[PDB]
Amino acid sequence: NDYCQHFVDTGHRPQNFIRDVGLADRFEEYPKLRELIRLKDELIAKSNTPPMYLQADIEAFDIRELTPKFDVILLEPPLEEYYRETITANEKCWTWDDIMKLEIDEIAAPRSFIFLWCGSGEGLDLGRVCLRKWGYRRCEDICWIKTNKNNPGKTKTLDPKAVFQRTKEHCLMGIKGTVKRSTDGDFIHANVDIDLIITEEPEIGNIEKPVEIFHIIEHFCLGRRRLHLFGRDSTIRPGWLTVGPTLTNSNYNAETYASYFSAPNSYLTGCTEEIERLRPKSPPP
Amino acid sequence: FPPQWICCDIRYLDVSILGKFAVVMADPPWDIHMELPYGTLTDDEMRRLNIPVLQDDGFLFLWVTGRAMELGRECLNLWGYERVDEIIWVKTNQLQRIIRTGRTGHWLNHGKEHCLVGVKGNPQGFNQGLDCDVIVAEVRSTSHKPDEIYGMIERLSPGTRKIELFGRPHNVQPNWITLGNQLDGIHLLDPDVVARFKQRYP
Numbered sequence: 198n199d200y201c202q203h204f205v206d207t208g209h210r211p212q213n214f215i216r217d218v219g220l221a222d223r224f225e226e227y228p229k230l231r232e233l234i235r236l237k238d239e240l241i242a243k244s245n246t247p248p249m250y251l252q253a254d255i256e257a258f259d260i261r262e263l264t265p266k267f268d269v270i271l272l273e274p275p276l277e278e279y280y281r282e283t284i285t286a287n288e289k290c291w292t293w294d295d296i297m298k299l300e301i302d303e304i305a306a307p308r309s310f311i312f313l314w315c316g317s318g319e320g321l322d323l324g325r326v327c328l329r330k331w332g333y334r335r336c337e338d339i340c341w342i343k344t345n346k347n348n349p350g351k352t353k354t355l356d357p358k359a360v361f362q363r364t365k366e367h368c369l370m371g372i373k374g375t376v377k378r379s380t381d382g383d384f385i386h387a388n389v390d391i392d393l394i395i396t397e398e399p400e401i402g403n404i405e406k407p408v409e410i411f412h413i414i415e416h417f418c419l420g421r422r423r424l425h426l427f428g429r430d431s432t433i434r435p436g437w438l439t440v441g442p443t444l445t446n447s448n449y450n451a452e453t454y455a456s457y458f459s460a461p462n463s464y465l466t467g468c469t470e471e472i473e474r475l476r477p478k479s480p481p482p
Numbered sequence: 483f484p485p486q487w488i489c490c491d492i493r494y495l496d497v498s499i500l501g502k503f504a505v506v507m508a509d510p511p512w513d514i515h516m517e518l519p520y521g522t523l524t525d526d527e528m529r530r531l532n533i534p535v536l537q538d539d540g541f542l543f544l545w546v547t548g549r550a551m552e553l554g555r556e557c558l559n560l561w562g563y564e565r566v567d568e569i570i571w572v573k574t575n576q577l578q579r580i581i582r583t584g585r586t587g588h589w590l591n592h593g594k595e596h597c598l599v600g601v602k603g604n605p606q607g608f609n610q611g612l613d614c615d616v617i618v619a620e621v622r623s624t625s626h627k628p629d630e631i632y633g634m635i636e637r638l639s640p641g642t643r644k645i646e647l648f649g650r651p652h653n654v655q656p657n658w659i660t661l662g663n664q665l666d667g668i669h670l671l672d673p674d675v676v677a678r679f680k681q682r683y684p
């Protein structure tokens with residue numbers, strides 16, 4: 198079955214024919230895989246800070262006011278291509294030069310990860326330059342692949358250089374500092390998730406990214422200090438600090454936020470013996 | 483025009499004998515700084531490949547993985563291209579499902595193979611937007627790229643001559659000349675190409 202030919206013929210995207218992509222019923226047929234995710238999510242929930250958020254004009258803001266240092270940063274600057282490709286923005290759009298000027302290195306923890314939504318065009322290249330500037334190494338590329346099961350078939354094509362129809366977005370993952378999978382299992386649980394998210398294309402004017410990106414980040418890094426830059430009211434989430442220009446209210450207090458991670462608490466979630474016995478690990482050397 | 487091929491070492495073949503191609507596709511054995519059960523080309527060997535002589539106007543398809551997702555971008559630039567798309571091949575199992583288990587990447591598991599799409603010069607006679615940038619096909623091996631790509635490339639640039647680097651026997655196709663070190667001998671049909679070959683290798 199040639200699903201490329203089938204798209205040409207019918208407008209149904211090839212990704213429409215991938216089976217069993219839903220998040221909730223994912224491992225319904227594999228109780229031990231489901232148990233690993235269930236137990237890790239319970240561990241995240243038990244240790245989550247209550248939601249915190251700050252309205253801020255990020256281009257004018259002194260980013261060093263966000264403390265303490267962050268174990269993970271999720272960055273979703275509003276690219277003009279989100280609205281133009283699908284429609285008129287109700288906030289300032291950011292160029293890649295604007296994004297690059299952010300001083301992310303001033304708030305990242307010495308060992309930490311970043312997840313940068315880059316779109317599907319020049320951002321795949323310019324986001325890599327931003328990673329370099331901030332002191333990260335590109336280490337994974339999480340692709341959000343969009344199905345069109347509800348409204349086949351062929352849609353927008355606005356980028357004079359593009360030659361294929363663009364049906365995905367890339368979230369680049371970067372690593373800062375030294376992390377060794379064999380010795381740093383108190384900081385990361387590798388290989389729990391895959392670098393793909395598959396959902397139906399959102400409604401017109403809906404620029405949200407799939408909530409599964411939070412699950413991938415939270416499963417992967419045991420650091421509890423999580424920053425979502427350019428988040429909105431609708432993305433506020435326990436375990437996260439959300440900072441963005443369109444937030445309509447602010448509850449962030451830097452001292453109170455930091456107190457959740459300091460003694461007698463830890464900035465790490467810890468782990469249970471049950472999760473240690475279920476999670477993927479290397480064999481003996 | 484029928485399938486044609488040259489068993490050769492691509493580092494040393496005088497590639498100027500082949501003429502100009504509207505599409506170049508390459509699936510090189512990148513040095514990914516890992517132990518592998520097959521031989522690789524060094525970064526310098528990749529940089530030095532004489533891709534620039536193969537085309538003046540048209541498209542490049544460069545499969546990349548690992549650290550080559552940056553090295554491949556560098557090579558696209560050393561060879562004179564600008565990146566204008568990125569295809570991903572989503573690998574499925576026998577039941578059209580994602581293989582989610584194992585430890586198949588360093589930090590996250592890996593469900594896809596990436597192919598950079600570059601453009602050079604001022605190509606003409608191409609059709610934009612006919613295909614999606616996502617391929618869905620069952621894996622045999624990740625080296626074994628999906629045959630779907632040939633139809634996408636033919637719909638993009640129909641009727642033009644095309645060249646594939648690091649191809650294996652199964653990759654030979656009408657309208658294509660295939661280069662690789664595991665091909666069966668030498669089989670040219672284009673009169674101009676074999677004329678230049680006989681002049682260069684008599």
Ligand SMILES: Nc1ncnc2c1ncn2[C@@H]1O[C@H](CSCC[C@H](N)C(=O)O)[C@@H](O)[C@H]1O
Binds near residue numbers: 648649
């Ligand atoms: N220096 C070199 N010159 C020519 N071929 C080489 C080479 N080094 C490695 N190769 C060959 O390049 C091929 C790459 S793996 C082949 C993948 C191919 N795209 C497919 O779809 O199946 C292998 O046959 C390997 O033997």
